[PDB]
Amino acid sequence: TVPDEPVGFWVESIPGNDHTLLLTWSETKGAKYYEIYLVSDSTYKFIASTDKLEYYVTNLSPNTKYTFALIAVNELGPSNFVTASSTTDR
């Protein structure tokens, strides 16, 4: 089957850094990789694909609320999307 939807998707600050966010999520049944999107103007814009359980999104603007969407993917297809948000507030 396609993978489960990831859970525990969190967007975390990096201490003293207002240009980066650390995304993390749980290990997901069936997942061969994960794909991350930025939710921008109520559309999804590709950011990265990874086989890890975390990803640093860099070159962000300070004082901005960012929302991301995450899927898990295998050969059969993707899971549903899950979202999470945080800010780069100084």
Joined tokens for residue 10:
């969190």
Q: Cα–Cα distance between 28 and 36 in angstroms, integer?
A: 14
**CA dist., res. 27 & res. 53, Å (int):** 7
Q: How was this structure determined?
A: X-ray
Ramachandran area for residue 30 (φ above 0: left; ψ -120 to 50: alpha; else beta): left
49 HSE (CA, 13 A, CB side): 7
